[PDB]
A paper describes a structure:
In particular, increasing the size of the para-substituent improved the potency in compounds 29, 30, and 31, all characterized by an additional ring, as well as in compounds 32, 33, and 34, having a branched side chain. This increase in potency is caused by the hydrophobic interactions between the para-substituent and the side chain of Phe1035, Tyr1050 and Ile1075. The most potent compounds were those characterized by a substitution in the para-position of the C-ring. Structural analyses revealed that the para-substituent improves the potency through hydrophobic interactions with Pro1034 and Phe1035 residues in the binding pocket of [name].
Residue numbers in the entry:
A (entry chain A): 952 to 1112
B (entry chain C): 1115 to 1161
The structure:
Amino acid sequence: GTILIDLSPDDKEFQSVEEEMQSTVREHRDGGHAGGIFNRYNILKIQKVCNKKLWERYTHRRKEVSEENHNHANERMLFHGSPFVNAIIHKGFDERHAYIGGMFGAGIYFAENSSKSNQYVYGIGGGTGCPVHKDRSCYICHRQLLFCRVTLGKSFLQFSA
Amino acid sequence: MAHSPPGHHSVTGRPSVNGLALAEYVIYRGEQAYPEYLITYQIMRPE
Ligand SMILES: CN(CCO)c1ccc(-c2nc3ccccc3c(=O)[nH]2)cc1
Ligand SMILES: [Zn+2]
């Protein structure tokens, strides 16, 4: 039941999403090994993901969390990169989308930095890079990220390197 | 998936070394995220 609606580049919603994407690029400690060498993106398309069942699944859980946390969902907009983005938009997030070996345990990971999520588009550590050229820094192949609405609720703070 | 720490709904990974890094977050229930935008892009080669 998922439909994708193209946003026009003239739409303020396109513009605010692109700005969050571009403005949260940073340099990475791997010198670009995982995600490639870049300071900015060429945005080709931004689509709104519309699925009523998946939305209601989200809002149901959001209310449960809010009610456990003095009516505060602690909702953020965060990036997610994954080889399974096309599965996620159709079927929703679930245990198959978790990073089993992540540093905070087996869960589903999101980043404030778009460039952090970009490191996972082709797999953990960038895998072997793009399907066509086997290049983790490919400047030709089209990449996809998700910009996601995420309920944090009461979040456990881990200070970490 | 693992469970959230008891009495919590997520984990926040705060950077403690790289002063320019932003936070990362983990949820343990797929229902706590909705994929609102699909962004298609290329990375650009620095000039
Ligand atoms: C499903 N999978 C491959 C192992 O299941 C996986 C998907 C996404 C990510 C991922 N990890 C991150 C870790 C820190 C910050 C951002 C991300 C991210 O966007 N995706 C990792 C593994
Ligand atoms: Zn390529």
